[PDB]
Amino acid sequence: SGFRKMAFPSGKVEGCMVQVTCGTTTLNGLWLDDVVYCPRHVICTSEDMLNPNYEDLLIRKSNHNFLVQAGNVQLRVIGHSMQNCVLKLKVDTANPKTPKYKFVRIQPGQTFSVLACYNGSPSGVYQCAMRPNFTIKGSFLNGSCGSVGFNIDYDCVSFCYMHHMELPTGVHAGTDLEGNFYGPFVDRQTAQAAGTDTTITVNVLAWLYAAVINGDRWFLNRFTTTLNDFNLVAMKYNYEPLTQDHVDILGPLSAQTGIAVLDMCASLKELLQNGMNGRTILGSALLEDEFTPFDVVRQCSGVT
């Protein structure tokens, strides 16, 4: 009973968080095996940030300039390299708390948990989605850079995000664990406006299926629609076009509830056209799009 914006248990990731300081900048690093990963902008001063030449800035840095502290103990840095927008600091000690892990580059619409950290210490955990414009709507303050996003499958942590910056619009941009930014963003204090933040239609449908499973059924109607008819409405409301791949991914939810995907699309179409009329769905007055069909099945089945 009930449906919540649930994050993965953060313990396996908390055991990897370290503090990295270079000069006067301190941010978070991720310690896995004998490597600490962190945003390369740790080498910048606020003055460098306007147009930094990372290769030139990195030449003036030696292994001893990177101070890495895991809890209250200092790690010895024996190597450093830049991979895209991340620094890889080789340390002389493998993290004994290293979980089974993978680095994955997620697709827009996919969800993940964030362990927000400051000075290598965890502050909180929340669930995010990679928006269709490649930003995330997080909760990060100065010092949060290097905090990571991840998913967990039983005992394997899949790291998908590392926090790098806030755009002037208060939205967040970062990289995968290979240092490649999601979207067109650059690690520079410059004019970077985000594109249209469209709604993740397949996620909204998944959440309507979660609502039906949990008893919130007022929005079920007597109608059906087609993928092309539904997409005409989705375009008008800045919703992502729904594909047959999306319909297929909603198959288990359609099977569990007995509500055909296209019938649920017709409920969604009427919700878009008429609004909620002051009503709520799963305690929300808007259509929630940060639950994937996998998340809904996971939460509704109790996967650990």
Next chain:
Amino acid sequence: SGFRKMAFPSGKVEGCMVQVTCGTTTLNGLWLDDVVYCPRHVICTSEDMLNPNYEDLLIRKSNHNFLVQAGNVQLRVIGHSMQNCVLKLKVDTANPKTPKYKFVRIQPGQTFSVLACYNGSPSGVYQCAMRPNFTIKGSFLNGSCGSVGFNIDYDCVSFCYMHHMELPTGVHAGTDLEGNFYGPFVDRQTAQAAGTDTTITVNVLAWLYAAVINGDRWFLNRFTTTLNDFNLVAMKYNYEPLTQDHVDILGPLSAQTGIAVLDMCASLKELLQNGMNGRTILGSALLEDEFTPFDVVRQCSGVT
């Protein structure tokens, strides 16, 4: 930048979760020092649940009937006792992962994180509030009993909730770690309807302060009100009466933003009377009440 429903990092609590089985019932237990705490209804069969005599049921149970497994290893049970609605299973081994901890009984309106578990394994973490009718709006399935709610202050975990049941209305009831239920609920499969779920006014104001700090200011108006005038409106909308204690607790947020508490109450009064007019605040189309003033300061300052 940004404001999220954030839970505490769950690692310290994940290290305490164990599985407890008695007969054919399996639920979660909390292992702290050499004691495992779990709901006493672990001793019941579904047939017992209608009107169980826990003292009589417990007489037929010996230490060897309580199977406690921490990960893949079995704990030896050397003692058992019932304290209100919880069982305390004394084991022969202190949990080596026991964090600094306290048991606290929270007040309605206070928030906490829940680590939902099944078979002693963590599934997810989310943030809850103890409702004014002493229920929680969680996300729990069969097997989730014994999952716990907690707050963390630097290194000390304050355990405040242990999950016991779902009411016929899909809301959740449970106890503090002394086994006393929050509210009038009993651990019996019987007619237990919840009272009025009023809105936690002081939390809504805290969240409006969070919105102002994060740039969402459209709802600020040219008005002020009084505590008595505001409470007349709060009563009409099933909001909890605001006291001078609540005004005092909002003091740091009022100081940070320069918006007097009573002016923010007047913004809230107009939001209640006129609605959102299809607009949003911090990505929500309703007034959020599960952030305390402490939570807002914590998130907006980056406490770890």
